Amino acid sequence: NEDLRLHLLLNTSVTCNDGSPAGYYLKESRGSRRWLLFLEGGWYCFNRENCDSRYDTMRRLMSSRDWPRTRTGTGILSSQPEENPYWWNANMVFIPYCSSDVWSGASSKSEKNEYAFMGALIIQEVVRELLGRGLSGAKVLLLAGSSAGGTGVLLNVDRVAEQLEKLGYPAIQVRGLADSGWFLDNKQYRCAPTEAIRRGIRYWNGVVPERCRRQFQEGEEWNCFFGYKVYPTLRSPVFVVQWLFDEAQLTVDNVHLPVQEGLRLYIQNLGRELRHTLKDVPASFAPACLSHEIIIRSHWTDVQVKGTSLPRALHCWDRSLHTPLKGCPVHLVDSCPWPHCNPSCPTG
Ligand SMILES: O=c1[nH]nc(-c2ccc(Cl)c(C(F)(F)F)c2)o1
Ligand SMILES: *[C@@H]1O[C@H](CO)[C@@H](O)[C@H](O)[C@H]1NC(C)=O
User: Fold this and answer.
1) What CA–CA distance (Å, rounded) separates 247 from 251?
2) Chain CA centroid to CA 209, Å
3) I need a surface site. Which of 108, 122, 200, 327 has the fewest CB within 10 A?
């Protein structure tokens, strides 16, 4: 099944990096007032030189010219209840990541700019075009995303909520699901995300949520790309999915996997730090695994924390947003200290 169909944005001034129109893939569900808008991930680029390289060998992530007419919805984007126990009947939207700006950019290609970085405007334009295609009737809009798209959820969920309020749709409940986008600005074990993001925000004209921007102020907006710093400033409900030993986190930390004491302590400390940042995140799913992304993989149902799968936790979250619920938990953070100490971790 290739059940999500491409729509290029009617406002062709909202573009991918190379000026081609951005777009979205849509699979409507007439019987449903639930809308899932998923933000693709795929790292970023932050200067002319590294964006040029990405354009050579990651061009679907900077351009729509080669996109296919359809995509198959998988995992949380699947319409089969066997694969997606959580929201199989929802209206499904996959928003391709073609702005290389962690979904933060608001800059057009111009005399001054070789590339457009319009991630934040792509999201707003998708939302506004979908209102004419049924989203106006929605009860819940779940903005989800993986990796850079998960960070994009944190950066954009409150803006989507404000956009819908200002457009006259205050009944649509906007919520966020951030998968594998909750990173730590920690010491490396041996370019670095904080500096690259600082440079990126400038290169992209990047924007961050207002309350977080007001806390950190000019020149320090890079702080708002880090979940534990931006999450407390957000008003929309956000469910956080994060492997405790995320492969992308380890990569930026210069860890490449007998492990000797120094690295053992480094890895154990990373897990404990991640766990600590989630202590006050009531809706979260954080298994003790070495992996990356979870929600659009076809076998996303297999992992469990304390005996509860992610589709179940998300269903429990839905119920909680109608006192904790008997046997239907929403805060699921592993406490064991080493990758794969949870037997349900992905096998690779
Ligand atoms: O697609 C991917 N894989 N790994 C990332 C990633 C890793 C670390 C950091 Cl700090 C960030 C952020 F938060 F600013 F973008 C993103 O993004
Ligand atoms: C197209 O998008 C741009 C950027 O968001 C916006 O300024 C402009 O008003 C939009 N045009 C139309 C006709 O919607």
Assistant:
1) 6
2) 15
3) 327
Q: Which atom of ligand 1 is nearest to the CA of 146?
A: 1
- Please say if 292 is a catalytic residue: yes
What are residue 290's DSSP bridge partners? 245
* Interatomic CA distance for residues 156 and 166, integer angstroms: 15
Residue 102 CA: which ligand 1 atom is closest?
Answer: 15
Experimental approach taken: X-ray
**Stated resolution in angstroms:** 1.3
Among 212, 224, 229, CA closest to 152: 224
What distance in Å separates the CA atoms of residue 253 and residue 293, rounded to the nearest whole number? 18
* Dist CA 35 CA 29 (whole Å): 9
Report CA(342)–ligand 2 centroid distance (Å).
Answer: 48
Q: Is the CB of 122 under 6 A from ligand 2?
A: no
